[PDB]
Structure formats: C-alpha cells, structure tokens
Amino acid sequence: ANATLKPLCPILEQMSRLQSHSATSIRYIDHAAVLLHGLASLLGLVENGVILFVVGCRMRQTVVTTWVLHLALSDLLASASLPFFTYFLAVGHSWELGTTFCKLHSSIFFLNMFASGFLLSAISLDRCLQVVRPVWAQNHRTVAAAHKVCLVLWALAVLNTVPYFVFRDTISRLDGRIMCYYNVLLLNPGPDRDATCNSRQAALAVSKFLLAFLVPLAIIASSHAAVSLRLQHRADLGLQHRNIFEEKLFNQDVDAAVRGILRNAKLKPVYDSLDAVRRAALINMVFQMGETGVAGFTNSLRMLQQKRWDEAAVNLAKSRWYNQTPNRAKRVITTFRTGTWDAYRRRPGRFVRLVAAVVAAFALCWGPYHVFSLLEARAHANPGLRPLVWRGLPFVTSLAFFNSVANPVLYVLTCPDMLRKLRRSLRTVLESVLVDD
Ligand SMILES: CCCCC[C@@](C)(O)/C=C/[C@H]1C(=O)C[C@H](O)[C@@H]1C/C=C\CCCC(=O)O
Ligand code: NA
C-alpha cells in the first residue's frame, strides 16, 4: 500500500494484471447479479429465521430437531455474510471494506462449509446407531448429548477455518479494484515461492474437499447402506414366529449389569421383587446412571419393592435424572407403572425425507464449488486452466451460498409437521387483529 511491496503467486499476480475493459479505471456493474444476491440475502435471513423459531419454540425438542436447528444456524450465518458479497458486486467487483473484514466475511463462508458437512455426517451416524444399536440408543440418545455433539463439531469447524482467516489478504488490481482472495505467501514463504504457492494452494483445496465433502458423503452413504441391510434383516425375522416380546462400543451386555445389580445390597431385593418386565427397566437405569446412581434413590426403590408404582413415579419425576433427560427417564418410569413394554414402542423413523433432501442439496451445491477449487490448485502448473477458473469459480461460489436459501424450503416441503406448526403460528399472528381489537 504505502510504498510497500508484497510477493504474490503467479495466479494472483495474473489476476491482478487482468485488464477488465481497457485500462481505464471504469467499473462495469452487473446489476442483474446484485439484485439476485441481494434478494437472496433477504430470503436467506428471513427463511432461516422463521425455521429457527418454529423448530426452536413451537416444536417438541428431540435429538433430530437439534441437528436441524444447528444446520439452520449455519445457513443463517451464511445468509448474514451474503449482504457484504452483494456490495462487492454493486461496487463493480472490488473489496472496499478494509483488510480485517475481508478475513471475517470469508471465514463465515468457510465456517458454514465445514459445519454443514460435519452435521450431516452426525445426522447420518445418528440414524445409523438408531437402527443398529437400539438398546444403547434408547438409553443414551438424549437431546443433552445431541447439543454437546453440535458444540464439538462447531469447534472443529471453527478450527479448520483458521487457516483461511490467516491467508485472506487484500490484493490491489490495476483496475483500481481491490481483491479479497488467498495470499499463500502472506506469511513464512518458502525459499522456492513457486513451490510454496503450488504446495499451500493445493493443500487447502484438498483438505477442504476431504473434510467438508468427500468424508461426509462417504459417512452418509456408508450409514445408509448399513441401516438398509439391517431393516432387510429385521423384516425377515418378524415374518417368522419370533415375536415373544423380546464393554464394546455401543454395548448391550445385560448379564454384566445383573451381576452388579445382585452384588449391590440396595438393588438385590428390588431386582428380586420385580416381574420380568420391570427388571429390564431397572437394568436400563443402571446403563444410564450406573448402579452407584440408581442406588442413590433410597426412597424410590422402597416403593418399587413394595409394588407402590404410582407413588414411585412421582418421586422419579422430581429427580434431576428426569429433569435433564426426561424422554429416556419417562420411558423407564412408565415401564415401572404399567409393567408392560409398550413405552419402548420403536415405531418407524421420521425426517427421512428431510435428511434425504438436505443431503442431495448439499451434494449439488457444494460439489461444483470443490471441482473448480481443485482445478485452481492444478492451474498453477497448467496455466491453460487459469482463465476457466477465473470466470467459472465465482459462479460455483454463489451456488454454495444459495444452498442456505434452499435448505429452509426443503425442511418445510418434506415435513408436514414443519409446515403445519408454521401455519398455526402464522395465523395467530394474523388472528389477534380480528378478535376484540
Ligand atoms: C469466501 C467466498 C465469498 C467471499 C467473496 C469475496 C468478497 O472474497 C470476493 C472474492 C473474489 C476475489 O477477490 C477475486 C475472485 O474473483 C473471487 C471470486 C471467486 C471465488 C470466491 C472465493 C472461493 C475460495 O476461497 O476458494
Ligand atoms: Na448448511
């Protein structure tokens, strides 16, 4: 800037010397694109806003809803960076908002990329453990954990975007335009700049393609294949006369706990004074909070041994165990009350249409982006690709942004419960005016 020089890579040094029009500082404005992205910015913000409200405040909080919630939060952040990308187009393709903002704005785009990929993998593996490890799932699939998993994924997402925040720099074009783009040589360049430019620009493109696209889709496909075969296998068994009403990761070792239950003085008589059905609900508690924890329930165990079911339930509903993970505790409590196994219904899964649509959208929108970015890495050696990447790369990036505008629509189209609770709240907002204004 102020009598400072910086070494640039051939790709950017050429993008800098690219003469738009004829060396005259006059900027052409594609008014069509500006309105498109600007409208997109509006839609994306409003759409993911209402989705966060419906799922968040007007919907029964489950584990699956927790994935959709974070997935729409990322799309909201993308929708929030999109306005600044429209200004970049209105100015005439130039970054006029200092250097430090060129990093944050860009990182936001990459943050939603890693986050969306990680969450979709989590949704897949969740659906897989739901089918392949039913016993372990009904004792540990709690919305509390789902929330904790999302935070770890966000931290991992914020971590893989750190490199992109660092190497984002503002490069001045000859047009008077200011670019906001990679600056591989911004810090500790190598004695062989041609190597560092090729090396780093290729490492970023591949790691991004693996962690944020290839691996997610691999996990997604693998998970889908595993559940598909298990359901094929479960259907075969059901059509046989095997309906009598019946440690390693994601375990299911019943014999192990029964030997610890009988080894505990407080639990042995309660486990002996129980029918077959209520003995299983007691083992489920041990799986969830251990024998040391279930033994803490001094007054409530007394009720179970004495067949005082309804009275025991009141006590458990007052416990922290019920007030932190109610769904799994309600399952165990009611099982003691009724003495049947209906609470563990295990009816078919929901949100299959939703998860399928979002995965398809994720694949089509981010697929093209990663294709051109890798060509960019290969275009260092092969200059013939550079002009194709120059013009073709900005279009695939706008595609990725529009994914955050389509996901909210896919949510509603493929889930009646979603559209239904949106209308009811949309009517309450249009029904207070009518009655006794
Ligand atoms: C982070 C994406 C949203 C930010 C957009 C913005 C303001 O950085 C403007 C960028 C443009 C330039 O500065 C030159 C170049 O034409 C570039 C447009 C083409 C692709 C976008 C980057 C893709 C990647 O990082 O792999
Ligand atoms: Na997303």
Structural domain includes residue 42: yes
Closest to 53 measured CA to CA, from 64, 69, 75: 69
Ligand index nearest the alpha carbon of residue 167: 1
Work out which ligand 1 atom sits closest to the CA atom of 171: 13
Single out the residue in 340, 361, 390 at which a domain terminates. 340
Assess whether 166 and 17 both reside in one domain: yes
* 55 phi/psi in degrees, rounded to 5: -65, -40
φ, ψ of residue 181 to 5 degrees: the values are -160, 175
Is residue 365 located within the same domain as residue 333? no
Choice from 82, 386, 397 to test ligand 1 binding pocket (greatest atom count within 8 A of CB):
397
Q: Is residue 246 part of a domain?
A: no
The domain that holds 329 is classified in CATH as 1.10.530.40
CA distance 7 to 188: 12
- The CATH number of residue 62's host domain is 1.20.1070.10
Task: Read off the amino acid at residue 98.
Answer: G
Q: Are residues 94 and 198 in the same domain?
A: yes
What is the spatial distance between Cα 140 and Cα 148, in angstroms, rounded to a whole number? 13
Which ligand sits nearest to residue 161's alpha carbon? 1
Report which ligand 1 atom has the smallest distance to the Cα of 208: 26
Which string of DSSP letters, residue by residue, matches 321-342? HHHHSHHHHHHHHHHHHH-SSG
Helix (H, G, I), strand (E, B), or coil: what is residue 172? strand
Resolution of the PDB structure in angstroms: 2.6
The ligand minimizing its distance to the Cα of 119 is 2
Asked if residue 345 is part of any domain, the answer here is no
Same domain, 44 and 164: yes
Residue 9 backbone phi and psi in degrees, to 5: -75, 155
Same structural domain, 29 and 159: yes
Q: Are residues 151 and 297 in the same domain?
A: no
State how many domains the chain has: 2
Who contacts 42 (Cβ-Cβ below 8 Å, separation ≥6)?
none
Within a domain: 5: no
Residue nearest to atom 3 of ligand 1 (CA): 106
- The answer to whether the beta carbons of residues 362 and 403 sit under 8 Å apart is yes
The HSE-up count of residue 396 (CA atoms within 13 Å, CB side) is 20
Same domain as 376, residue 313: no
- Report which of 144, 147, 152 is spatially closest to residue 118, judged by C-alpha positions: 152
Q: Are residues 331 and 397 in the same domain?
A: no
Domain boundary among 306, 340, 374: 340
Are 215 and 286 in a shared domain?
no
Residue 180 Cα, ligand 1 centroid: separation in angstroms? 7
Residue with tokens 């290839």: 214
- Residue 85 token pair: 């990308």
The experimental technique behind this entry is X-ray
Domain co-membership, 59 together with 176: yes
13, 374 Cβ separation under 8 angstroms: no
Angle at 292 between CA 291 and CA 298, to 5 degrees: 95
- Does residue 243 belong to any structural domain of this protein? no
390 CA closest ligand 1 atom index: 16
Find the domain containing 325 and state its range: 254-340
- 113 alpha carbon to ligand 2 midpoint, in Å? 7
Phi, psi of 258 (to 5 degrees): -55, -35
Mutate to test the pocket of ligand 1, among 111, 178, 180 (most ligand atoms within 8 A of CB): 180
380 found inside a domain = yes
> What spacing in Å lies between the alpha carbon of 80 and ligand 2's midpoint?
13
How many A from CA of 85 to the centre of ligand 1?
9
Shared domain check, 181 and 94: yes
Domain assignment present for residue 370? The answer is yes
Please give the DSSP secondary-structure letter assigned to residue 244: S
As a whole number of angstroms, the distance between CA 411 and CA 418 comes to 7
User: 3-state class of 38 per DSSP?
Assistant: helix
75 CA from centroid of ligand 2 (Å):
5
369 lies in the same domain as 421: yes
Domain boundary (302, 318, 340) is at: 340
Is the separation of the CB atoms in 275 and 306 below 8 Å?
no
CB 417 within 8 A of CB 234: no
| 233 domain-assigned | no
**In whole angstroms, how far apart are CA 72 and each of 58, 67, 116, 402, 407?**
15, 9, 9, 13, 8
Which secondary-structure segment (H or E) carries 418?
helix 416-431
Ligand 1 binding pocket, CB closer than 6 Å: 85, 88, 95, 106, 109, 179-181, 373, 393-394, 397
Number of the ligand 1 atom closest to the C-alpha atom of 376: 26
Which ligand lies nearest the alpha carbon of 402? 2
Q: Where are the beta strands (DSSP E) in 91-154?
A: none
